[PDB]
Structure formats: structure tokens, C-alpha cells
Amino acid sequence: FRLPPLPTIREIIKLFGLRAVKQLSQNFLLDLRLTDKIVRKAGSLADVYVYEVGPGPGGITRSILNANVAELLVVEKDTRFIPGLQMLSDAAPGKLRIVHGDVLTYKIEKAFPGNIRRQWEDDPPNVHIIGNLPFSVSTPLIIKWLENISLKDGPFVYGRTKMTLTFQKEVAERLVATTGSKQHSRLSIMAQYLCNVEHLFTIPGKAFVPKPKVDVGVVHLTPLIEPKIKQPFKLVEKVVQNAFQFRRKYCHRGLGMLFPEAQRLESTGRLLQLADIDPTLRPTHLSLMHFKSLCDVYRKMCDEDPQLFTYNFREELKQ
């Protein structure tokens, strides 16, 4: 017969390598011009203690190191990128600390000196968190961090520490969306009640390798001195999540799911009435102050009735 040639090992490696990368779901920024821009937009990092999450090939890492940073600590999950980061540390001695870990669990409360901590009401501290992370990591990460801001712990034991982070365009858009927008949703309230949030700019997907199917938003967050709602994070999260579950219906429908069926007509009516909200507002028109009212009223209902808080409407739906 006549059969095709064997692959060379070079071809085999290329095959294994490309497939290896088309997994992992990182969107590499291999362009120092863009990583320079991200760092520039984050603000001055002069004498700042920087925490970079998931540096990967280290484009953002190089841009940070060039910004008169006091110190940079990076946490990286994939060992494959670690020796490249090591090389980088050797080029800037004393400047770069590398940790092989998971940004979702790694605690940085003791990573920088205690003397750099600042009161909550003071200006934000010389700690800044910067990161270009996989979309599947950055969403739960910001949610963990928002709860940390609520508790004033985690990265927020230093004070009102700043974040500059990439997200998919649409997640970026939800984070800064205001009332009445199709994007004003659960994440809009969660971030905005706790932080000042600004969408710095958008980077086209084409700029990343591999090319994701969406664009990438760069978002800056600074914790608020006075948060817009003062109730436990999990309470706010529950009200907000219930408020938004049915987007094209009166908000009464979503908020009603906070209450067992047997009291739902009366209780949902009372919640809206004590909160002083039109029960026919669609969720997108619910503002931070509506949510403050809703959460305050719900808190008192929970205190009067300790069965309320762990009520789950789907469990009831199982007859």
C-alpha cells in the first residue's frame, strides 16, 4: 500500500501541547502593551504591596514589577507556569514572591506587614489586588471577596483594599449596571452595596490567546467606607437572589419565594408595604435603597420568626 508518514515527535508534542492549552480556560495576555495599560489604569502601584492572582505566563506580572511596587506576591495554581515566574523573580530580586496555590482559598491576611494596615474609614491601604483570571475563577472569587468586604476580613484586614480585575464583558457590565438596565441584576447590587465599582475599559477577545468567544472587561473596585446595607452578607444575598429570579414579572413574585406558601400572600404583602416599595416594580428597577429597605424589613421578620431564614421554597415544592 502507501500509508501516511508517522508523526515526528515535534508534531506529537505540538499536538499534545495545543490540546493541553485549549483546556485550562485561561485567556493569556501576551501583549505587554495591554498588560501595561491594565496596570496604568489600576492607578499608582508606587510603594504598593501588590497581590496578583493567577499570573500565568506573567504578562501582568512583568507590568507590575515595572511600576515601582514595594513588593509583589503571586498565587499560581498551575505548576507549568511556575518556573517561568521563578526566572522572573531572579530578574527582579527581592521584588517577587511566588506561591503555588489556589486563589480561592489562599489567605493573604498575613502576607504583608501588619503596619501597612489602615482603618476602614481611612484612605485605602498600600495593598492592591490585580488579576486576569479564567472566567470560571473570577466569578466565585469576587463573590468570596464581596463577603470578605462585608466582614472586613480576608484581603480586607488591611483596610479598604483596591481590586483591578478582568471579567467577561457581560459580567463586567452587570457589576456596574444601574437601575432600569437589562444588566442590572444580582451581581450589580452585591458589588455596589459594598464597593464603588468602575468599568475601566474593554479588551477585545482577539487580543487574548486562545481567543475567547467574548470580550473582556477590566473593572476597578474600592470597598465603601459606609456600605449601603448593614445586614449579614448571606441575608442580603438571599433577598437579592430571590428578588431577581423572575426578571419579567412583578418583583412580588420573586420576593414571595422568601415565605412558606401558607403565609406567602400576607407576608410578601407586608414585606413590600413595610419596605414602601411598589409590588409591581420589575426587579431591574429595584435600587440599592429599595434593597436596603427590603433587607432591613426581612431581618426583623427573621428575628421575629427564626424558621424564616432557612426557608427554602424548592424544598416546600417537593409536596
Side-chain angles (χ1 to χ4, degrees), residues 118-169 171-173 175-181 183-205 207-210 212-247 249-281 283-299 301-303 305-315:
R118 302 279 204 82
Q119 302 305 330
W120 199 253
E121 47 284 345
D122 194 354
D123 289 298
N126 285 259
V127 186
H128 196 146
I129 295 170
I130 304 184
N132 175 47
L133 290 159
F135 304 141
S136 68
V137 179
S138 58
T139 288
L141 188 63
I142 194 58
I143 292 173
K144 174 196 176 305
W145 279 342
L146 288 170
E147 186 169 9
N148 292 135
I149 293 167
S150 161
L151 295 169
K152 301 178 188 187
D153 70 354
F156 312 88
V157 292
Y158 298 98
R160 300 187 293 110
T161 116
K162 279 186 287 191
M163 295 148 277
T164 301
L165 292 168
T166 70
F167 296 97
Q168 309 123 259
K169 194 183 127 187
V171 168
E173 288 173 340
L175 286 158
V176 295
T178 53
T179 5
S181 143
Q183 302 276 56
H184 190 64
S185 45
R186 180 182 51 80
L187 254 189
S188 323
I189 307 309
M190 305 304 299
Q192 294 181 27
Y193 100 92
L194 288 166
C195 299
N196 182 43
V197 188
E198 354 171 357
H199 180 156
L200 301 177
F201 68 105
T202 287
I203 298 160
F208 297 77
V209 195
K213 342 87 246 144
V214 283
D215 292 328
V216 175
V218 183
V219 177
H220 190 76
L221 304 91
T222 318
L224 288 177
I225 295 174
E226 293 290 314
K228 311 303 183 48
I229 317 194
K230 286 182 183 75
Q231 292 298 345
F233 184 82
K234 287 301 194 169
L235 179 141
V236 177
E237 192 181 53
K238 181 167 193 191
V239 175
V240 167
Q241 184 231 295
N242 281 286
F244 283 102
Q245 72 205 117
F246 311 123
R247 286 190 71 83
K249 325 244 82 178
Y250 302 145
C251 71
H252 192 277
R253 322 272 192 208
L255 289 160
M257 297 310 112
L258 292 163
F259 302 101
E261 302 180 21
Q263 64 184 88
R264 182 171 304 160
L265 202 60
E266 187 182 8
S267 285
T268 307
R270 222 163 103 85
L271 171 62
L272 289 156
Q273 176 190 41
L274 296 174
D276 188 42
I277 294 165
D278 181 339
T280 66
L281 270 187
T284 170
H285 290 123
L286 284 172
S287 66
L288 295 156
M289 291 296 95
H290 292 137
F291 281 110
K292 182 173 196 290
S293 296
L294 289 173
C295 288
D296 286 352
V297 171
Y298 181 71
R299 173 62 178 280
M301 288 180 161
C302 279
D303 294 340
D305 184 356
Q307 269 164 340
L308 202 56
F309 189 64
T310 53
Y311 174 69
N312 169 265
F313 80 88
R314 312 170 204 269
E315 272 306 321

Side-chain angles (χ1 to χ4, degrees), residues 71 73 97 106-114 117 154-155 157-158:
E71 183 181 340
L73 165 81
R97 298 158 64 198
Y106 192 76
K107 288 199 204 188
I108 66 157
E109 271 146 320
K110 294 284 189 316
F112 308 116
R117 299 183 175 199
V157 292
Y158 298 98

